[PDB]
Design a protein around this ligand. Structure first.
Ligand SMILES: Nc1nc2c(ncn2[C@@H]2O[C@H](COP(=O)(O)OP(=O)(O)OP(=O)(O)O)[C@@H](O)[C@H]2O)c(=O)[nH]1
Ligand SMILES: Nc1nc2c(ncn2[C@@H]2O[C@H](COP(=O)(O)OP(=O)(O)O)[C@@H](O)[C@H]2O)c(=O)[nH]1
Lengths: 430, 430
């Protein structure tokens, strides 16, 4: 009955999964033991006869360190050890090792646990998974897992929460190679995917959070806040609701263009909570602010398709309509003739929740606007520049060649992403 | 991926490894008997990377001792912290070639290499999550270089799936125990340029020059150079000995820092300048350390880094500094001297910060990079070999065994091709 399954791969991916599950259990008031002090929580949590609730997810990685700290954290009476799978070898920022050299030696057992936890998923709608493009494990094993489940079921949904790496936080220079490989090998399978450019969250933590220097904990907490705002419609019921299938319908008109550039607002520090919070019109205007998204794109050069909004707070429909009318007068909005409709409304009365002791302060209104346009192609152009500047000299290719791979796959993925970006610009061309 | 197997080779390698062990044990709070006595939990968090749990609560280094001259092992035992090493790791020949590769390679090398294979297997199949091997070896003496080549070749062919690492003591013309250095160096590089995947060359004449001028050590002995090289190598391996997102394991280090199969040769760098016993050093500001990496005498290879372009850059700072100032300084120096890098490698400057400073210091700087500046070592050994072989001087010493010079021709051709690759990568545009 409306069951859903989430997956976690890569150190960053599983850390963000841990953070988002923490914020989820705080949203439902779930104690670390699983005690129950909407009914949509059953879609992400499975309840036994004893009242213990465990999320219908799984944390896996080729390395145990993050899983080790998870198993020694503060949720011992929450997660069973059998959905916490650790490998031995490491992909080491390599898509090849994470996919074929080391990926296939464990994905069979991974599928064993996935099948056993899906044994009681009668109303299964789709699968969720968290991965970073830079992460070698989160690249190779992600692609292998995605294609394997596409073979297994197919029409069952597989929606992505991807993390787009940034140079300041980047660890491996080979990261654009991994990003290209992931997007090429998952484009035909990722029904919908959300990127998280870490430069955007870095500047948000620097300026909006009033933090002297962004930390992994804070940025991952805000990313988990964004993820929870996105998944609230699945995890909560209101007058206006959107589910995974209709997420796909209203967010993915072009099968190749399945990268809806979402956004979230607002954010304020604890010390600045003493000031009056921004109104519905103010937050709605702050949505389309160029530095108020998860990527460092240029919305001023975008061709919009249709607005989708996620109000989870004290927003009345009258304020929603007023904000929509005011935004319709914006001079930075360009639409497409093939999609005359340009607005979708979703309102939730449940107040937003934040991790205790965090930088973000409690607010009574929130917005998670969903967008898709040619503005997302700026990150595509940046990674294209990186890939072309590297692959022209065939830098770092030998590491992939040593794992039973050739240059031909790199080249064909290059032209596939070139076809994608030319599709973006052609749709942007009048 | 939580453990590393140490290997020693030759005398100088033996004392540099012993000094490494004693310094890291001092900064890891490990007593001479092997029981932890520190306070910081970081030292014990992943002590398994370079230590093994022993009887009681004792921690033993996971090293191995390989040589032929009987005096090397006795000198190792004489030095401090010698007894904490594994008692059965002493594998030494009964005769000793004494910088004579021809005799020590075959007459004494066969049974020695068989025994070291036996022991490396003994702690390999018994090992839990083995990843790779790293070596501290010399090249000036033919004997120690011979053992180093033999061990690296056998452990690479026996373990093709394990990362390969080694540190080389490059021969210098200022001090020369034997003049057979060109032959040994050519054969060693011919082996390693494809056998090894990591190489932090340490040039002896640079050490002598810095001791004479910068460190005022008018008479640089073995220990005088050993102290500073051990400090530098502790600094470079600080990436591994303590938790850090950048360069989690040896494989991540290799994939991030090696752009080409033959580009696995590194410029070592450390700051501030320090000696053995001199406590007059005071606190130094971060920008001084940041600009110190452009200094030739602050490097450990007598090159001209200004001529070359850093293909990849690795740096770590130890201490408690506001590292936002640190990456502001790194951005400033990158903007100032982008002509000293390659534009087609996006963001090769990867840097993290370490909380614990080294012994006798509060802030420290460690530099690791890959460029064409290493090619001048190959040019020097090429001209030395050409001078020594044009008259076929000392060739009869090698030919006494009966081998021809075909492999010498292969080695010189391969290293000339390597030099050409370095030059073409330097001259390459965007
Ligand atoms: N959003 C986010 N990204 C992170 C975080 N930590 C690291 N990253 C980025 O993610 C990249 C690696 O992603 P991971 O998924 O953790 O790595 P992996 O998939 O396990 O692959 P390996 O690192 O080779 O084991 C790094 O290059 C970082 O730039 C984090 O806390 N949050
Ligand atoms: N930096 C440094 N170099 C050394 C040391 N001992 C020897 N060397 C160099 O190594 C060369 C001799 O090689 P050697 O160590 O005798 O080879 P082995 O006997 O086979 O191990 C000489 O040219 C020295 O410059 C040392 O303690 N420190």
């Amino acid at each position: 009955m409306r069951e859903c399954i989430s997956i976690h791969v890569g150190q960053a991916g599983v850390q963000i999964g841990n953070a988002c599950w923490e914020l989820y259990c705080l949203e439902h008031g779930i104690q670390p033991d699983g005690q129950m002090p909407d009914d949509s929580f059953n879609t992400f949590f499975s309840e036994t006869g004893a009242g213990k609730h465990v999320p219908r997810a799984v944390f896996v990685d080729l390395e145990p360190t993050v899983i080790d700290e998870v198993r020694t954290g503060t949720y011992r009476q929450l997660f069973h050890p059998e959905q916490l799978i650790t490998g031995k070898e490491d992909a080491a920022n390599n898509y090849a090792r994470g996919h074929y050299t080391i990926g296939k030696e464990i994905i069979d057992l991974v599928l064993d646990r996935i099948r056993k936890l899906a044994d009681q998923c009668t109303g299964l709608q789709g699968f969720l998974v968290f991965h970073s493009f830079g992460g070698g494990t989160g690249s190779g094993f992600t692609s292998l897992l995605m294609e394997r489940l596409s073979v297994d079921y197919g029409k069952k949904s597989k929606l992505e929460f991807s993390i787009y790496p940034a140079p300041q936080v980047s660890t491996a220079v080979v990261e654009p190679y991994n990003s290209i490989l992931t997007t090429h090998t998952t484009l035909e399978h990722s029904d919908c995917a959300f990127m998280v450019d870490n430069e955007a969250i870095y500047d948000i933590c620097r300026r909006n959070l009033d933090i002297e220097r962004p930390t992994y904990t804070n940025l991952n907490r805000l990313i988990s806040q964004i993820v929870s705002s996105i998944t609230a419609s699945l995890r909560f019921d209101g007058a206006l609701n959107v589910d995974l299938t209709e997420f796909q319908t209203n967010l993915v008109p072009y099968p190749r263009i399945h990268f809806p550039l979402a956004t979230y607002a607002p954010v304020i520090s604890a010390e600045k909570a003493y000031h009056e919070q921004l109104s519905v019109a103010e937050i709605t205007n702050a949505c389309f602010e160029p530095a108020n998204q998860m990527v460092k794109c240029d919305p001023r050069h975008g061709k919009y398709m249709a607005c989708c909004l996620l109000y989870r707070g004290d927003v009345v429909p009258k304020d929603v309509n007023a904000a929509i009318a005011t935004i319709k007068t914006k001079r930075s909005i360009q639409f497409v003739d093939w999609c005359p409709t340009g607005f979708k409304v979703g309102i939730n009365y449940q107040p937003p929740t934040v991790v205790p002791g965090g930088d973000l302060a409690k607010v009574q209104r929130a917005v998670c606007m969903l967008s898709n346009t040619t503005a997302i192609a700026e990150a595509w152009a940046r990674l294209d520049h990186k890939f072309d500047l590297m692959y022209a000299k065939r830098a770092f290719v030998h590491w992939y060649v040593g794992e039973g791979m050739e240059e031909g796959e790199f080249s064909e993925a290059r032209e596939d992403m070139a076809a994608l970006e030319k599709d973006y610009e052609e749709v942007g061309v009048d | 991926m939580r453990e590393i197997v140490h290997i020693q080779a030759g005398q100088c390698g033996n004392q540099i490894g012993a000094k490494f062990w004693e310094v890291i044990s001092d900064e890891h709070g490990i007593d001479p008997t092997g029981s932890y006595h520190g306070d910081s939990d970081l030292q014990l968090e992943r002590i398994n990377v370079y230590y093994n749990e022993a009887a009681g609560n004792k921690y033993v280094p996971r090293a191995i001792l390989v040589d032929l001259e009987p005096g090397t092992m006795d000198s190792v035992r004489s030095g401090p912290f010698g007894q904490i090493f594994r008692p059965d790791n002493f594998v030494f020949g009964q005769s000793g070639a004494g910088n004579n590769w021809a005799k020590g390679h075959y007459t004494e090398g066969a049974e020695l290499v068989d025994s070291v294979l036996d022991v490396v297997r003994k702690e390999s199949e018994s090992c839990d999550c083995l990843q790779g091997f790293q070596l501290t070896h010399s090249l000036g003496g033919g004997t120690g270089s011979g053992m180093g080549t033999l061990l690296i070749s056998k452990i690479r062919e026996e373990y093709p799936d394990r990362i390969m690492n080694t540190f080389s003591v490059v021969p210098s013309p200022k001090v020369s125990d034997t003049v057979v250095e060109p032959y040994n160096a050519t054969l060693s590089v011919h082996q390693l340029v494809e056998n090894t995947d990591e190489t932090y060359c340490i040039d002896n004449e640079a050490l002598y020059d810095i001791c004479f001028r910068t460190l005022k050590l008018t008479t640089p002995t073995y220990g005088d150079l050993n102290h500073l090289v051990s400090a530098t190598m502790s600094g470079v391996t600080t990436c591994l000995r303590f938790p850090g997102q950048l360069n989690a394991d040896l494989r991540k280090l290799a994939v991030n820092m090696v752009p080409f199969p033959r580009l696995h040769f590194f410029m070592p760098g450390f700051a501030p300048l320090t000696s053995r016993g001199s406590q007059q050093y005071r606190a130094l500001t971060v920008p001084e350390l940041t600009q110190q990496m452009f200094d030739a005498k602050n490097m450990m290879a007598a090159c001209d880094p200004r001529h070359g372009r850093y293909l990849t850059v690795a740096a770590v700072f130890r201490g408690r500094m506001s590292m936002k100032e640190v990456d502001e300084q790194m951005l400033n120096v990158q903007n100032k001297n982008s002509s000293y890098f390659v534009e087609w490698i996006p963001n090769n400057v990867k840097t993290a910060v370490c909380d614990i400073p080294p012994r006798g210091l509060k802030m420290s700087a460690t530099f690791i990079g890959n460029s064409t500046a290493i090619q001048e070592l190959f040019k020097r050994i090429s001209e030395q070999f050409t001078a020594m072989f044009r008259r076929k001087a000392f060739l009869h010493w090698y030919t006494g065994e009966g081998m021809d010079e075909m492999e010498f021709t292969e080695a010189e051709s391969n290293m000339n091709d390597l030099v050409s690759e370095y030059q073409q990568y330097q001259d390459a545009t965007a």
